[PDB]
Amino acid sequence: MKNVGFIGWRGMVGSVLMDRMSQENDFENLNPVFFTTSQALKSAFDIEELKKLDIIVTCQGGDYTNEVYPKLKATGWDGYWVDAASALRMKDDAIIVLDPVNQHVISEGLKKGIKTFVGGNCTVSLMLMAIGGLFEKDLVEWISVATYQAASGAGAKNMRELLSQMGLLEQAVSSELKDPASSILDIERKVTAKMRADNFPTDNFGAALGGSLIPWIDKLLPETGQTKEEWKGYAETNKILGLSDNPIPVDGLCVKIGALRCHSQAFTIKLKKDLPLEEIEQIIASHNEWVKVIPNDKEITLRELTPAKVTGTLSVPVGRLRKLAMGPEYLAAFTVGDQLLWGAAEPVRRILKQLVA
């Protein structure tokens, strides 16, 4: 069978991948070889042991990749490189995977002789799994996005900080909250106080996240005024759709909120043909077995369209669909997807399964 090496399989994303693979018995279809960066099992830095593999799967990160990738390719290595980091997402000899969406693109690239497969950005990947149909039929003209992003996107220490923040905030009015008749204004006066205090842990976000929000993700790009996170929206969406020559505008603002592992997005999609709302739906629900069209009803939206609902699942619900006051050629949509699954580990695990077949 195929000899596949795994690097950074103990990190957060690497762990979700290992678990998913176990749950689906993917190891029974390949010869696994594990590497480590520890000096406490092969060395993730041993180019020779790495050159012997048919496939390298890494969740280690950008640095590792930027340090080992070129080094390996220098030895004439003929194998496949599957990476979750964004380090190689743009390179011309690399493809961004998301098979439920861009299979056709993946198939052609495998033939053209591409050996580098990179998973895509969480927000873009999640957006495509939700409203893929619209891009299928080519009904999309442009998209304005506002995201409600989760802590896991920045990392494990971030999730721990958010939880810590929430804890300290309640603990600050723990007694007052128990007295059904205490002043609400006094209580918030206190919570806001603790949130603003010096001992309030914010080293990981650079600001309060619990009980608040941060409208800035990643680095600034003086070029267009976007943040690198918002940019990937235009860049990666099109590279996944292979329409880098006929670029569909995808843009908006990215904001992190107090959620652990699910991203949510508010969509304003400009179509190209006033079609029945009842039709636009079937087009969405048909694109893939995961997306789930949630009817625009209260009790059900509260039960289905939330992070509490989709967390740790592969379900991609999309809802609150309706035309916007700007005309029947303006659709509104809201969606929620697990950041660690379709936004990270799952797309890698799928291309890999395709490779060892």
Curated annotation (Swiss-Prot):
Q: Does the keyword section mention Transmembrane?
A: no
Q: What GO terms in the biological process aspect are recorded for it?
A: 'de novo' L-methionine biosynthetic process; diaminopimelate biosynthetic process; isoleucine biosynthetic process; lysine biosynthetic process via diaminopimelate; threonine biosynthetic process
Spell out the molecular function terms from Gene Ontology: aspartate-semialdehyde dehydrogenase activity; NAD binding; NADP binding; protein dimerization activity
Q: In which pathway does it act?
A: Amino-acid biosynthesis; L-lysine biosynthesis via DAP pathway; (S)-tetrahydrodipicolinate from L-aspartate: step 2/4; Amino-acid biosynthesis; L-methionine biosynthesis via de novo pathway; L-homoserine from L-aspartate: step 2/3; Amino-acid biosynthesis; L-threonine biosynthesis; L-threonine from L-aspartate: step 2/5
Q: Per UniProt, which keywords does this protein have? A: Amino-acid biosynthesis, Diaminopimelate biosynthesis, Lysine biosynthesis, Methionine biosynthesis, NADP, Oxidoreductase, Threonine biosynthesis
Q: Which residues are catalytic?
A: 122, 263
Q: Which reaction does it catalyse?
A: L-aspartate 4-semialdehyde + phosphate + NADP(+) = 4-phospho-L-aspartate + NADPH + H(+)
User: Which residues take part in binding substrate?
Assistant: 149, 229, 256
Binding residues for NADP(+), per the UniProt record? 10-13, 37-38, 60, 152, 339
List the EC numbers from the record.
1.2.1.11
What the entry lists under InterPro entries is as follows: Asp-semialdehyde_DH_CS, Asp_ADH_gamma-type, Asp_semialdehyde_DH, NAD(P)-bd_dom_sf, Semialdehyde_DH_NAD-bd, Semialdhyde_DH_dimer_dom
Q: What is known of its domains?
A: Consists of two domains, an N-terminal nucleotide-binding domain and a C-terminal dimerization domain.
Q: What does this protein do, in the record's words?
A: Catalyzes the NADPH-dependent formation of L-aspartate-semialdehyde (L-ASA) by the reductive dephosphorylation of L-aspartyl-4-phosphate.
Q: Which family does it belong to?
A: Belongs to the aspartate-semialdehyde dehydrogenase family.
Name of the protein in question: Aspartate-semialdehyde dehydrogenase
Q: Which gene encodes it?
A: asd
